[PDB]
């Protein structure tokens, strides 16, 4: 019963998700400049193909504010496979418990939007 506030970015190519410094935080007008900091966490589903063999699907990367989500305890910038960090200029390095996470029973994800001019790696698309 915890989830990202936003939809995921699907990785369609070999390049992992990353952003230039200052980019990558989803738009959320219910938040302040100090709040604009967090991580994306990769999740990879496995399902059986038509031929019967289990296979990995395209990875999906989900944004969580700093101090929330599966890596709520990780400090900003900590190195961990499948975790990348993003922060807008002016963000404060503190846990965002006042934003927290989404309960899927109560609210649907909002579409992850990034400001015009955000660089994305090959194989990624964003609204």
């Amino acid at each position, epitope marked *: 019963a915890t989830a990202s*506030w*936003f939809t995921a970015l699907t990785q369609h190519g070999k390049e992992d998700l990353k952003f230039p410094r200052g980019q990558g935080v989803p*738009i*959320n*007008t*219910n*938040s*302040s*400049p*100090d*709040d604009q900091i967090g991580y994306y966490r990769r999740a990879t589903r496995r399902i059986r193909g038509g031929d019967g063999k289990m296979k990995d699907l395209s990875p999906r990367w989900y944004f969580y504010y700093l101090g929330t989500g599966p890596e709520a305890g990780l400090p900003y910038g900590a190195n961990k496979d499948g975790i990348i960090w993003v922060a807008t200029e002016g963000a404060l390095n*503190t*846990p*965002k*418990d*006042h*934003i*927290g996470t*989404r309960n899927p029973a*109560n*609210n649907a994800a*909002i*579409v992850l*939007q990034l400001p015009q001019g955000t660089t994305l790696p090959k194989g990624f698309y964003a609204e």
Partner: nanobody
Amino acid sequence: EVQLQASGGGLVRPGGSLRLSCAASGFTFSSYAMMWVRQAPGKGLEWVSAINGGGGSTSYADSVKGRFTISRDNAKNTLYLQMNSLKPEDTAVYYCAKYQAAVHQEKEDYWGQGTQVTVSS
């Protein structure tokens, strides 16, 4: 059902102070981050502030930071907004709500009527 009723609005002079309250019912209040939002005449809804269940983690719109404080009393199922150094631009209907992310939040029916704040000489 989940209900959050705002009160405490009034008419004050610029520079004045007002404390808004929000009574929660129908859900476990302490389990939720909360927010205040406001809507001024002929303007879009503006997010004001947010607070975690534990009461120590907060943030504010740049337009109110340093003049307003959000707080909560979980034993009383109540959320507060203490407003100081009020400006005419703070005139609006104020609403409380469970925190939610949004891109250009619009008014929700489940917020109720809100509470009117008017700041004028």
